[PDB]
Amino acid sequence: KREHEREVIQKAIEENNNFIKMAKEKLAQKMESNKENREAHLAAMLERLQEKDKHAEEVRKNKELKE
């Protein structure tokens, strides 16, 4: 009976510790996945505007061809 009583209290401890652990890792994965996602969206946006500037350079060099 004493051995079972320690099995129960250690299982309760293990349950609470595991709930905290899973919560802590699910959250870290969510925040990291979200941070990378948002940086990828902003990077894709700024790269798209980078092409706008290169095409604007192509337009100015094309006009420059007077002779």
Next chain:
Amino acid sequence: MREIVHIQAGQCGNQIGAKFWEVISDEHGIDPTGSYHGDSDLQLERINVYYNEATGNKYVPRAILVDLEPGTMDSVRSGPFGQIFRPDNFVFGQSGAGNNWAKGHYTEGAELVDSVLDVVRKESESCDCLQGFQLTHSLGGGTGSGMGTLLISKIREEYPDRIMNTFSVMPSPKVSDTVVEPYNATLSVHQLVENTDETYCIDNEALYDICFRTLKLTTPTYGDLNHLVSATMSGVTTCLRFPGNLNADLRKLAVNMVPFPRLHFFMPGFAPLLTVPELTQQMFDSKNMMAACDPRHGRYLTVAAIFRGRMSMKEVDEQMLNVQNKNSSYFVEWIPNNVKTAVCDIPPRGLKMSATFIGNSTAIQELFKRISEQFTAMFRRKAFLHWYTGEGMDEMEFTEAESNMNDLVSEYQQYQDATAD
């Protein structure tokens, strides 16, 4: 609090922008010398959204005036409230765009774009919490059309996480300045689709038709047209300027009005042009829209309605709920509760009650069909292309912008015919 940076570019931009600053300074009680002389503390509760506070408790508009020719900005500085503006915020060109998009976007405008960015960077760097940018311009000219859209793209590069809002003026042959206006508009619409969060379509055709059919004039000047724009621009920013809970800032307005990123072109409406039922009915009337489109020819994705003045806010709830039920088939089912209603106890000048309508309707495709039909009829013959290809442009840029606009109209039709159940 939440600062908005204002930019005006070109003739039409600086003109309507002047009237805008004249109207709201009058509403917030600010004289041409930048001094407050009002009665209600609600005029200063969110005054910092559009104004800075300098030495001597003076309120200076956070506005930047841009143009490739000085003639338009000179009469602004000489006009009423010309002293209220920061003289360093005047950015002046000496060449002009000749009402040519390529000159505004690539040649004359690109030479002056850096000096504008410096002034914009100073106004933004001293902002507690920048909301974004508010542009006034036309799409049928050269400076505001070409350099405006260029200014949008260059600002997006430096402030990609800020809201980009524009008051764009659509050209029509009823007040046509030049003949190449379908070219400038189609190239600019292609830019507004990709780089702005929300665009108020100020259609000159709707302005002239109101200034002709409703208000009888026959010979409507730009002042009568801009009078409609000032009242409209004052109405659609009431939620930004006074203590309000609904659509209080630019991002909350964009979140609640834009269900899909490209479909961000709004139909502004204003009433009157005597009671809350009458005010509500006129507000939804196709003849009160500042865009030449009939909403009964399309569907409402989202709508925002601002009642200004003193009235029964219970009667307003009953009237805005009544029009949604009676006109149920004109609102998309797959967006529940897509009509928001705001109330501001402070009316505009000269009116005891007013109503401002901002609709995101698929019927806006009619305005884009009108500009595209004038484009293709002009592009079918390659007319006036030397103005643009002389500035280094290629025919690809024209065909793409037209193909982009044809995809926008088909996108509006896609969601007009979309159902649930």
Next chain:
Amino acid sequence: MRECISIHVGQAGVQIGNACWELYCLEHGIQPDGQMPSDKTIGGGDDSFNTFFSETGAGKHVPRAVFVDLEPTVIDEVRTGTYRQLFHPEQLITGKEDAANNYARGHYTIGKEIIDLVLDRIRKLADQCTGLQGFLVFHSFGGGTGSGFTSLLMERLSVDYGKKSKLEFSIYPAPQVSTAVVEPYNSILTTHTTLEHSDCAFMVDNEAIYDICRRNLDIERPTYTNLNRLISQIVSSITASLRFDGALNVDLTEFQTNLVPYPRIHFPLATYAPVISAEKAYHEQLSVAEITNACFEPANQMVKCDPRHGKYMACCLLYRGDVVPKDVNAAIATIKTKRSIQFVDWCPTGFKVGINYQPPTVVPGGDLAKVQRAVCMLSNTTAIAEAWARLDHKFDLMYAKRAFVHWYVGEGMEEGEFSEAREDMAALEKDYEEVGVDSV
């Protein structure tokens, strides 16, 4: 001992917190400067009201509360308001720009910039507790902060405080007073994320409270002040067992044992009576039998649903004021005949009763009349799933066209998070069907 820390998140949670802490002070005799002339133990003590108020040496009774909002506008009214001396500045935490009605901004983009500071301040409150019991989290479903930041906070509280009890007072969105078109999205997302981190959640349907104000108080167009003062009466009834004491005062954790048969079935239905105007209260006194009868009128429920369409798994009556058991048992005996109250077959059918002798009070100048006796009912009925169903249907309508989803994806979220959250709701709806089916 047995302290409770309150956390008010976003505009709705903050403004409701103002109503609750104002009502608490009136119930306990605490002045706006925190002084309590009746409290003879200066600088501390273990009275029942100390579960919510700490004490300074100068005799000020300080709420065990934290206010959090990602924008300063609302909390600035606490800072300059009537009860500004009640709180220390460290309990009032504000950001610069809000979540813009976007769960992603409340949970991720804007939220992560202030979450550590908020937890640090919560930790400073917990360190003053001799035996912290848990948290009460007030928030809206629909706001970007009330949904996104609350989810992030409840996740962090599970980590920093183990399985310590976390209770919710959540504002279910109603079109009559709504702020954003994307409120079904934020509601499903936060309900999914918080589901496994909340022991008990009292939902409040703004349309239910709105209609109660119109009908019972004769307010043409009720405001947030009207709604929050009514909501504060329900919160007061629920926490009165913690804040007050008595021979018949049944603790809330004891009700909680009966109210939560399974971890996910933790959404009790609240019903309050009497809500009457001063004019009607001048005419007639409402007995124990009358206010008890009103608890089974669906018009007095905090959430719009039909309990006849479901089954009961628990039924608790929380009385306050001039009430004795003999009246309660007689009134319950009447209700157990004139009303058909169907229980699931795996649950006992009795009603659990608590009485708090401290009489209810009202804010002076308000619209609620001061009555001699009030009751709050907390029942666990499968019918509350109808509220999930209505909300889920609005979500499904917009998500089928991916309407507004770009505002969430642009802030770093994925379509998978929407479908995963919606599936959790479908499973929760299925859970509520299963618990109500008779045994074999």
